Scaffold this active site. Structure first.
Site, mmCIF file in Angstrom:
data_model
loop_
_atom_site.group_PDB
_atom_site.id
_atom_site.type_symbol
_atom_site.label_atom_id
_atom_site.label_comp_id
_atom_site.label_asym_id
_atom_site.label_seq_id
_atom_site.Cartn_x
_atom_site.Cartn_y
_atom_site.Cartn_z
ATOM 1 N N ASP A 1 -35.868 30.237 -16.689
ATOM 2 C CA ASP A 1 -37.065 30.899 -17.066
ATOM 3 C C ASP A 1 -38.102 29.492 -18.303
ATOM 4 O OD1 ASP A 1 -35.487 30.968 -19.502
ATOM 5 O OD2 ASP A 1 -36.851 31.066 -20.427
ATOM 6 N N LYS B 1 -35.758 23.551 -18.000
ATOM 7 C CA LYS B 1 -34.316 23.759 -17.819
ATOM 8 C C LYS B 1 -33.611 22.873 -17.322
ATOM 9 C CE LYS B 1 -35.464 27.713 -21.362
ATOM 10 N NZ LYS B 1 -35.432 29.150 -21.576
ATOM 11 N N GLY C 1 -28.226 26.524 -23.602
ATOM 12 C CA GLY C 1 -27.414 26.062 -25.066
ATOM 13 C C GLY C 1 -28.846 25.335 -25.547
ATOM 14 N N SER D 1 -29.510 33.732 -23.672
ATOM 15 C CA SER D 1 -28.442 35.215 -23.804
ATOM 16 C C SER D 1 -29.585 36.316 -23.064
ATOM 17 C CB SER D 1 -30.370 35.451 -25.490
ATOM 18 O OG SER D 1 -31.054 34.545 -24.784
ATOM 19 N N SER E 1 -36.013 34.679 -23.931
ATOM 20 C CA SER E 1 -36.154 34.719 -22.362
ATOM 21 C C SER E 1 -37.790 34.822 -22.217
ATOM 22 C CB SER E 1 -35.593 34.084 -21.489
ATOM 23 O OG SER E 1 -34.145 34.747 -21.669
HETATM 24 C C1 LIG Z 1 -31.817 28.902 -24.313
HETATM 25 O O1 LIG Z 1 -30.781 28.547 -24.297
HETATM 26 C C2 LIG Z 1 -32.019 28.094 -25.553
HETATM 27 C C3 LIG Z 1 -33.663 27.351 -24.494
HETATM 28 O O2 LIG Z 1 -34.411 26.999 -26.532
HETATM 29 C C4 LIG Z 1 -33.018 25.924 -24.711
HETATM 30 C C5 LIG Z 1 -34.276 25.084 -23.731
HETATM 31 C C6 LIG Z 1 -34.392 23.817 -23.807
HETATM 32 C C7 LIG Z 1 -32.949 23.215 -22.598
HETATM 33 C C8 LIG Z 1 -31.747 24.701 -23.116
HETATM 34 C C9 LIG Z 1 -31.763 26.062 -24.122
HETATM 35 N N1 LIG Z 1 -31.652 28.002 -26.255
HETATM 36 C C10 LIG Z 1 -31.906 28.379 -27.560
HETATM 37 O O3 LIG Z 1 -31.235 28.250 -28.232
HETATM 38 C C11 LIG Z 1 -31.964 29.560 -27.751
HETATM 39 C C12 LIG Z 1 -32.092 30.748 -28.554
HETATM 40 C C13 LIG Z 1 -30.905 30.986 -28.789
HETATM 41 O O4 LIG Z 1 -30.794 32.217 -29.998
HETATM 42 C C14 LIG Z 1 -32.457 30.222 -25.758
HETATM 43 C C15 LIG Z 1 -34.364 29.660 -26.076
HETATM 44 O O5 LIG Z 1 -32.134 30.901 -25.604
#
Ligand SMILES: *C(=O)[C@]1([C@@H](O)[C@@H]2C=CCCC2)NC(=O)[C@H](CCO)[C@]1(C)O
Ligand SMILES: *C(=O)[C@]1([C@@H](O)[C@@H]2C=CCCC2)NC(=O)[C@H](CCO)[C@]1(C)O
EC number: 3.4.25.1
Lengths: 244, 204, 250, 244, 233, 222, 196, 243
Positions: free
Chosen positions: F17, F33, F47, F129, F169
């Site tokens: 996503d 991503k 992460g 998530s 997401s």
């Molecule tokens: C998904 O893992 C995550 C994303 O914001 C990042 C963004 C770019 C590349 C790695 C993934 N990471 C998080 O920490 C978020 C969730 C926190 O609970 C989110 C949106 O899932």
């Protein structure tokens, strides 16, 4: 052991001279001549490109004039590669100073630091000294326009006009003959070219064999400007000054 | 406690038609105590602009670091650094302190001198790049800024129009934030010229 | 144990010569000829694959190496020294540039890095200078195409065209006659092939000759699609077949 | 030119390492020692020159044990020998510590080999002034080895080094021919005592003391032990008898 | 020849010799004589102390390393100090960690190895001193001779230093005799003094010139100098 | 975050996503991503964003250097080994959760790596998530011997489960297809099912609306 | 996790469930907890997946370098390398490992390395959260010198019970047979072992 | 000045005498070896000479098993050969651990050549007086022969030979390939490739061999192994029933 192969680059001669420094200076004396002339309204750095070919790219070339700061530049005489090593550390020292005090580094402070580095290779480490001599052209708000020189020994001095490299004896005598305290940048530029012109070991003095730079305080501004002349720019001034 | 909520402050950048704008408040406080109304958070290296929110000492340090690095860059590359490249330099510089980061929220803005293409980007304290096409927000009123921007913003605004938008976004976000305000400055950037305007806002 | 050679092995002689640099250059002189020619839209570097035996597989030995997708190098002198210089060059392009600015270094800067590595082998304790001269050709957005020579001392200079090694003197002379600032890449390749023929004693074909160019982007050599801004490497080694095709029009 | 024999890791024009060769001279100038591989073990014996009546008999032991299943004897500079054994011991302990099982003779041999070869790689160290005969019993048999100052080593049926190596080698070659089926630990001990007495002729001027050790799967349980008392005297006699 | 191969300990001569080591051995020969002999109950050290001027002292030549061990030196005194100090630590370590007195044979092995390291590496120099070590351990009385070459040997008696050959021939003759002087220290000591005087020539052993040391069954290593040695002159 | 990997008869596909969050706020509505390790080895990261990006580029750099040194195409098991040993060393402090896929001289591969350094192999995988919404779809529609088109669909549907059902997401679907004999094809924003409706009004301000105190030109030229 | 290694007449068999969980979620239901560190020396992994992989990878590296120099290593030597790593790094590792190998001289052997890094040679061993439930069963049904079929049966029944009571165990049952004949991979699906 | 012959620094002619003298050392063992590529195997032959009757013939070898797939034959003094072998094995193992796959023959070769190049440039390290011939059946390149010398040089070969009578073997092999027009021995069984190897060894050296005069190594898919005296005898017998 290893001792057998150690040249001992840092010892005194029975006369109290430093072998390697003297030999490095001997090396410098065969390098293209570089000249520095300080005027009331600026400074001129001129250098003769040692060895050249029809195929050498001169537009993308630079072997003698390097920008250290926006207010300091140097002319090189000696091993280019050795020079670059020193030039880079000099560029870093200027930035460290700027970051620390939020003021551009005074010209002498930078010159002293570089000379101190050279001095080191002279007293410890067992390494060969740098076969390089610099002419520093810079400006600061404490001493205005300044001209310095440093050689393998790590010693440095100030000048109104000076030269390094080949035929310095001849070049110095000519400069000491026509230099005048109230000179002007344009007068100086001409003196520099004339001097090189009479000391060249080459046939004639063409633009393709020269590098030119000036540090002036463009009246219409109030700040200091460094101008490393472009091939065409040198070709031009060469004709004007009457050397065509 | 939270290094990013000690001094306060905000920065916002937007893209427009052949232009970019980056604005910031001028406050510097120590929690509830206002200390300076002249703490600008925008800096520039050549034609590239950088705004930094967060812990003031790190804002100052980062600017001094990037001035240092962009100077050496120009000396070696023999050309001024571009927005895209600088963004990479910021990212790697921040990540280098991955486990002892600078508590800042950087924002890059500028126009590529060769492509003329407008560019903005944001980063988290450890270097993660956010390259938005519209706007980027940072600071103690970033939630408010997101609210303002998401509504007020529209594509291809002309310099004079983008100015009004970026300013209204900044000003109204700052007035809903205890730690932002006490003055504001906006930078309108074009390929050829850059205008800097100080705004008039509440002083409480 | 422990390298106790912490002193320089290259020092100044009374005349001011740096013996080991000189000797290294002499090693370069005995080396097979290699050259580079800059055109208006590209650069070509070439050399001869002096197979030391017919049982050897000359392809398993490349004298022309890719340093970055827009920069290549060739040499004259000691092959093993060149090989490690290339490993170090490829790596420094990353550690000192790509990992910092997210892009490959411009030709002059990478050349500057290589030169530094070489200068250090001229002053550091316990080593001898590299017995090679490199010709590095590349392209970068703000400088266009360029060609550089790097000698054992660490010195480097930009060229429009040049040659190094065995018959460098003659080859340089031949290049001065044929070079002009309006050469197209194919022209440079042709001139390169002619210049190299004078230096080759035996067989002269796409299997005994190694040649590469720095020209347009080869999207077909990228390996993936999807990023508009990624168009492919400008460096390309010519195939044995591509060379022969051009040898017929010799 | 010359001088190729002054520094340790230097190749001479003919590709030799003279210092290693000079080390060998120190070895040839030493007491004679040997090793005999039997059907299920190995025997080690050495000549101990009695410089004077003042030397307490049986006290200055020359044969050394490594771990619990390896014996080592050497000719040349004794200190160098101990140095090599100390290393072998660390080498053996390290191996057991990591792999649980006591070090195999082949593995052990190479450990000593790489170490000795290491001392021919730099001019900051001197080669080992000893040739070492060692071996023992392991997971699959008995093994005998001899290591030269060059680091060179091979598995042997029988081996000798030092002053009377020729006599010894001669005697060893006889045994090899007259016993294609293999000597026994018991026999090898006697045979060894003899070879040493015989080889003592190349030094018949000074009186000597005999020393023997063995490692037999059946006689010592695969552990290295010194031949003492009755078994020793019995071997002394067997020699004293065949020396006439 | 020699001159090209005696510049440092890391060089073998064409005949397989180590000149620096041999030159070190020469410093011992130039040293004042000292003697060592033992029975089955005791071990004795007798050393001739040498003086600079008649206004100077006679330099000590016996060092105690532990309650059951000690030695006599001949050559560079500083090197004896270094080696004896290492021996003091080794003895000490054995006691503190294993609550065990260090075997004289083990001490000999440790000294051999310490000396050897200074004969195979560049930069160092061999030790220029000889040592005679005596001690009473779990296997009785012991006497060891230490040479800078790293060679250590166990004997009933011996001597090192200038003119040491006299005392050595005497002992090699008196062997069957003194080796049985059990339970009688004074007799062993007198025997030692008789051996040492076999190397005199210059003068005769005086009170502030003679130095004796003994260790044994119920005797902790102790040094006797001056008045305390009078009853032996 | 929702990231997935799906093997098909002649290759592997990965998708993700495009939402990036800072707590409950969406910092980036269209982040990327999907990372490239080498031309034909791509990675999907979940992460800590700075970490997935940094770790992907570091190993990518070394993989390139290894490829040049060995004169061979990079292998997925190599990128996997370098990533896991790096992540293991940092005991989970580098918050990178990745799905690494690609084709190399030995075939097509699909793996997953967790921040602590452990790896897994499978025909279908998902992290983030949105992981559970995605996996629910995969466990319901996956089958062996999927065609390229089927794989893209399955993967794409998995990300959607996440966009719609996971608050972590949203926005778009990015895809990358790696087929055994062809170039890897990166499909940025392969799906954009979340376009914002036209605003109810224009907030363009009449010029002069903002009170200005002082104005000046900024010097850019040196 | 439920893992076990059993020695029998012709050698030794390793068995394991295929579940890895992160809380209540099954992160992987087809996990392979049976790892090869040498041709005929394998291990059963329990505890940290990251830790056991790193350990296994290093052991494999060590045994490869061992082989290059001294030939094939004994199962005991392999268990020793595992032990060294687990004991010396006990503070930072969570690894319960069963080492099993087939030697021609020694036939099958089993060494269990529990949490502290101690080593225990046994006729058979069980480990993993699921093992707690089959201590009684295994102790009542294990016999020495069983046949390949019997041993596969003992393991299959034991693990099915472990999977039955342990929420941390599940998926398929994998086995690795180690005999002079070579290496055999067995797998048993739910529908088969659940109704035993 | 005259020391430019003791350490690895340039001579006025730009030569490195120590590297040259190291090459001299490679022939010290007076052993010759050769390698040829089969259709899907790689063979290396090497004379075996055990002069001393007191030696255990089984422990005299110049062929080494570097990895499950890489084999290496050495021409030079055994101590330097064993130094190279240990290093190569360690390098081979580390590579697998770090990169996840078996180190290719050519890569191991380049690695060892690079290490050699360094003894060539750093004064405190002496070159090793050996020539290393690596063989295997690479998973990407197929049968492979890569050889490295004291100069740090290395390259791939269709076939190669090393030692005192290197030249005679080389020209022999060259002639065969000029004739066959292909770059390998078109044989399906390594046994026959080994036989070809020995046959040409004999022709070129003009010598007959017993089962204890040779030493053989064979590389096949996923494995490299050396033959026994008996595996060899069976080889010698076969070639005999053709002449
Ligand atoms: C998904 O893992 C995550 C994303 O914001 C990042 C963004 C770019 C590349 C790695 C993934 N990471 C998080 O920490 C978020 C969730 C926190 O609970 C989110 C949106 O899932
Ligand atoms: C079993 O010990 C364990 C497994 O997930 C791992 C997976 C692969 C190899 C080592 C064993 N370990 C755990 O921590 C899991 C439970 C987490 O709550 C599980 C299933 O017990």
């Amino acid at each position: 052991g290893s001792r057998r192969y150690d040249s001992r680059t840092t010892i005194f001669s029975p006369e109290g001279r430093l072998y390697q420094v003297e030999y490095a200076l001997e090396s410098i004396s065969h390098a293209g001549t570089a000249i520095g002339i300080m005027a009331s309204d600026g400074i001129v750095l001129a250098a003769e490109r040692k060895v050249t070919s029809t195929l050498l790219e001169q537009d993308t070339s630079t072997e003698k004039l390097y920008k250290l700061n926006d207010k300091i530049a140097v002319a090189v005489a000696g091993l280019t590669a050795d020079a670059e090593i020193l030039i880079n550390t000099a560029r870093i020292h200027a930035q460290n100073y700027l970051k620390t005090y939020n003021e551009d580094i005074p010209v002498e402070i930078l010159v002293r630091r570089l000379s101190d580095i050279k001095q080191g290779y002279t007293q410890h480490g067992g390494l060969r000294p740098f076969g390089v001599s610099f002419i520093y052209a810079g400006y600061d708000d404490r001493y205005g326009y300044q001209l310095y020189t440093s050689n393998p020994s790590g010693n440095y001095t100030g000048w109104k006009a000076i030269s390094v490299g080949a035929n310095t004896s001849a070049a110095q005598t000519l400069l000491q003959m026509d230099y005048k305290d109230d000179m002007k940048v344009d007068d100086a530029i001409e003196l520099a070219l004339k001097t090189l012109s009479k000391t060249t070991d080459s046939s004639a003095l063409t633009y393709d064999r020269l590098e030119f730079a000036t540090i002036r305080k463009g009246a219409n501004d109030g700040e200091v400007y460094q101008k490393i002349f472009k091939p065409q720019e040198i070709k031009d001034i060469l004709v004007k000054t009457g050397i065509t | 406690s939270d290094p990013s909520s000690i001094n306060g402050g905000i920065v916002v950048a937007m893209t427009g038609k052949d232009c970019v704008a980056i604005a910031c408040d001028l406050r510097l406080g120590s929690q509830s105590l206002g200390v300076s109304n002249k703490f600008e958070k925008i800096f520039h290296y050549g034609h590239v602009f950088l705004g930094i929110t967060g812990l003031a000492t790190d804002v100052t340090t980062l600017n001094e670091m990037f001035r240092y690095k962009t100077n050496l860059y120009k000396l070696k590359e023999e050309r001024a650094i571009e927005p895209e490249t600088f963004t990479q330099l910021v990212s790697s510089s921040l990540y280098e302190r991955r486990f002892g980061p600078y508590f800042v929220g950087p924002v890059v803005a500028g126009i590529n001198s060769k492509s003329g293409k407008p560019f903005i980007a944001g980063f988290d304290l450890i270097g993660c790049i956010d390259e938005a096409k519209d706007f980027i927000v940072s600071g103690t009123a970033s939630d408010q800024l997101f609210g303002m921007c998401e509504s007020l913003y529209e594509p291809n605004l002309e310099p004079e129009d983008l100015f009004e938008t970026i300013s209204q976004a900044l000003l109204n976000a700052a007035d809903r934030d205890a730690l932002s305000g006490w003055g504001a400055v906006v930078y309108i950037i074009k390929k050829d010229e850059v205008v800097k305007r100080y705004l008039k806002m509440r002083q409480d | 144990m422990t390298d106790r050679y912490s002193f320089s092995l290259t020092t100044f002689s009374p005349s001011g010569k740096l013996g080991q640099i000189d000797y290294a250059l002499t090693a370069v002189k005995q080396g097979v000829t290699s050259l580079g020619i800059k055109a208006t839209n590209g650069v070509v570097i070439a050399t001869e694959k002096k197979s030391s035996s017919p049982l050897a597989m000359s392809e398993t030995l490349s004298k022309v190496s890719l340093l970055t997708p827009d920069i290549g190098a060739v040499y004259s002198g000691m092959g093993p020294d060149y090989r490690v210089l290339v490993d170090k060059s490829r790596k420094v392009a990353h550690t000192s540039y790509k990992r910092i600015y997210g892009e490959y270094p411009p030709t002059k800067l990478l050349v500057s890095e290589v030169a530094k590595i070489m200068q250090e082998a001229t002053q550091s304790g316990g080593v001898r200078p590299f017995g090679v001269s490199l010709l590095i050709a590349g392209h970068d957005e703000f400088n266009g195409f360029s060609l550089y020579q790097v000698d054992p001392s660490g010195s480097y200079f930009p060229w429009k065209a040049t040659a190094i090694g065995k018959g460098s003197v003659a080859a340089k002379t031949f290049l001065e006659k044929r070079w002009n600032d309006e050469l197209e890449l194919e022209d440079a390749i042709h001139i390169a092939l002619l210049t190299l023929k004078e230096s080759v004693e035996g067989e002269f074909n796409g299997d005994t000759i190694e040649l590469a160019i720095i020209g347009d982007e080869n999207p077909d050599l990228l390996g993936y699609t999807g990023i508009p801004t990624d168009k492919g490497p400008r460096f390309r080694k010519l195939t044995s077949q591509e060379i022969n095709d051009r040898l017929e029009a010799l | 030119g010359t001088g190729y024999d002054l520094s340790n890791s230097v190749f001479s024009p003919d590709g030799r390492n003279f210092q290693v060769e000079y080390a060998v001279k120190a070895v040839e100038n030493g007491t004679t020692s040997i090793g005999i591989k039997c059907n299920d073990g190995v025997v080690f014996a050495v000549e101990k020159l009695i410089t004077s009546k003042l030397l307490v008999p049986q006290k200055n032991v020359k044969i050394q044990v490594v771990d619990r299943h390896i014996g080592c004897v050497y000719s040349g500079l004794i200190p160098d020998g101990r140095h090599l054994v100390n290393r072998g011991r660390e080498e053996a302990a390290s191996f057991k510590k990591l792999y649980k099982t006591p070090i195999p003779i082949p593995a052990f041999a190479d450990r000593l080999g790489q170490y000795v070869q290491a001392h021919t790689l730099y001019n900051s160290v001197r080669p080992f002034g000893v040739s070492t005969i060692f071996g023992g019993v392991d997971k699959n048999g008995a093994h005998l080895y001899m290591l030269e100052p060059s680091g060179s080593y091979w598995g042997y049926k029988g081996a000798a080094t030092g002053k009377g190596r020729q006599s010894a080698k001669a005697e060893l070659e006889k045994l090899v021919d007259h016993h294609p089926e293999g000597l026994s630990a018991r026999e090898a001990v006697k045979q060894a005592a003899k070879i040493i007495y015989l080889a003592h002729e190349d030094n018949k001027e000074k009186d000597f003391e005999l020393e023997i050790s063995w490692c037999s799967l059946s006689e010592t349980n695969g552990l290295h032990k010194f031949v003492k008392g009755d078994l020793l005297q019995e071997a002394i006699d067997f020699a004293q008898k065949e020396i006439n | 020849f020699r001159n090209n191969y005696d510049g440092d300990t890391v060089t073998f001569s064409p005949t397989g010799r180590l000149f620096q080591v041999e030159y070190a051995l020469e410093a011992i020969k130039q040293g004042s004589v000292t003697v060592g002999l033992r029975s089955n109950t005791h071990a004795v050290l007798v050393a001739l102390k040498r003086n600079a001027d008649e206004l100077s002292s006679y330099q000590k030549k016996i060092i105690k390393c532990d309650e059951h061990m000690g030695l006599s030196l001949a050559g560079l005194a500083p090197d004896a100090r270094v080696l004896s100090n290492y021996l003091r630590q080794q003895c000490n370590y054995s006691s503190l960690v294993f609550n065990r007195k260090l075997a004289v044979e083990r001490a000999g092995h440790l000294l051999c190895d310490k000396a050897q390291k200074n004969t195979q590496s560049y930069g160092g120099r061999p030790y220029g001193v000889g040592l005679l070590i005596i001690g009473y351990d779990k296997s009785g009385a012991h006497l060891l001779e230490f040479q800078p070459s790293g060679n250590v040997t166990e004997l009933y008696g011996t001597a090192i230093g200038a003119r040491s050959q006299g005392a050595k021939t005497y002992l090699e003759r008196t062997l069957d005799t003194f080796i049985k002087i059990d339970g009688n220290p004074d007799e062993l000591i007198k025997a030692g003094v008789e051996a040492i005087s076999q190397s005199l020539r210059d003068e005769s052993l005086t009170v502030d010139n003679l130095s004796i040391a003994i260790v044994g069954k119920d005797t902790p290593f102790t040094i006797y100098d001056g008045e305390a040695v009078a009853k032996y002159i | 975050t929702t990231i997935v990997g799906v093997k098909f008869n002649n290759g592997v596909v990965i998708a993700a996503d495009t939402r990036s969050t800072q707590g409950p706020i969406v910092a980036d509505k269209n982040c990327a991503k999907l990372h490239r390790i080498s031309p034909k080895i791509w990675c999907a990261g979940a992460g800590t964003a700075a970490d997935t990006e940094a770790v992907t580029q570091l190993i990518g750099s070394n993989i390139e250097l290894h490829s040049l040194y060995t004169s061979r195409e990079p292998r997925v098991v190599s990128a996997l080994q370098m990533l896991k040993q790096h992540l293991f060393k940092y005991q989970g402090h580098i918050g990178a959760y990745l799905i690494v896929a690609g084709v190399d001289p030995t075939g097509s591969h699909l793996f997953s790596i967790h921040a602590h350094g452990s790896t897994d192999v499978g025909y279908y995988l998902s992290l983030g998530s949105g992981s559970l919404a995605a996996m629910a779809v995969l466990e319901s529609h996956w089958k062996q011997d999927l065609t390229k088109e089927e794989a893209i669909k399955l993967a794409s549907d998995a990300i959607q489960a996440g966009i719609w059902n996971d608050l972590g997401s949203g926005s778009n679907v990015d895809v990358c297809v790696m087929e055994i004999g062809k170039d890897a094809e990166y499909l940025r924003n392969y799906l954009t099912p979340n376009v914002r409706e036209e605003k109810q009004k224009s907030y363009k301000f009449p010029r002069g609306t903002t009170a200005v105190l002082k104005e000046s030109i900024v010097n850019i030229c040196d | 996790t439920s893992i076990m290694a059993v020695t029998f007449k012709d050698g030794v068999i390793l068995g394991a469930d295929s579940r890895t969980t992160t809380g209540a979620y099954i992160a992987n239901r087809v996990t392979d907890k049976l790892t090869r560190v040498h041709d005929k020396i394998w291990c059963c992994r329990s505890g940290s997946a990251a830790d056991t992989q790193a350990i296994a990878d290093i052991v494999q590296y060590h045994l490869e370098l061992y082989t290059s120099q001294y030939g094939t290593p004994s199962t005991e030597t392999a268990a020793s390398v595992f032990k060294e790593l687990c004991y010396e790094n006990k503070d930072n590792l969570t690894a319960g490992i069963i080492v099993a190998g087939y030697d021609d001289k020694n036939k099958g052997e089993v060494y269990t390395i529990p949490l502290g890094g101690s080593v225990h040679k046994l006729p058979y061993a069980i480990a993993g959260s699921g093992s707690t439930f089959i201590y009684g069963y295994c102790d009542k049904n294990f016999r020495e010198n069983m046949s390949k079929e019997e041993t596969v049966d003992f393991i299959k029944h034991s693990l099915s019970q472990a999977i039955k009571w342990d929420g941390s165990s599940g998926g398929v049952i994998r086995m690795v047979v180690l005999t002079a004949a070579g290496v055999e991979r067995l797998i048993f699906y739910p529908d088969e072992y659940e109704q035993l | 000045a005259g020391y430019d012959r003791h350490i690895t620094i340039f001579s006025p002619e730009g030569r490195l005498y120590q590297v040259e003298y190291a090459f001299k050392a490679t022939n010290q063992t007076n052993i010759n070896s050769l390698a040829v590529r089969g259709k899907d195997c790689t063979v290396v032959i090497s004379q075996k000479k055990v002069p001393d009757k007191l030696l255990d013939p089984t422990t005299v070898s110049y062929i080494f098993c570097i990895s499950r797939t890489i084999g290496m034959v050495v021409n030079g003094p055994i101590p330097d050969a064993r130094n190279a072998a240990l290093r190569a094995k360690a390098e081979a193992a580390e590579f697998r651990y770090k990169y996840g796959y078996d180190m290719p023959c050519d890569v191991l070769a380049k690695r060892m050549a690079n290490l050699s190049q360094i003894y060539t440039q750093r004064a405190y390290m002496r070159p090793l007086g050996v020539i290393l011939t690596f063989v295997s059946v690479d998973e990407e390149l197929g049968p492979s022969i890569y050889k490295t010398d004291p100069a740090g040089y290395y390259v791939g070969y269709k076939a190669t030979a090393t030692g005192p009578k290197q030249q005679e073997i080389t020209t022999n092999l060259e002639n065969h390939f000029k004739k066959s027009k292909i770059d390998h021995i078109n044989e399906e069984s390594w046994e026959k490739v080994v036989e070809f190897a020995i046959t040409h060894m004999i022709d070129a050296l003009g010598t007959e061999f017993s089962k204890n005069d040779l030493e053989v190594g064979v590389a096949t898919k996923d494995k490299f192994f050396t033959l026994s005296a008996e595996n060899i005898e069976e080889r010698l017998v076969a070639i005999a029933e053709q002449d």
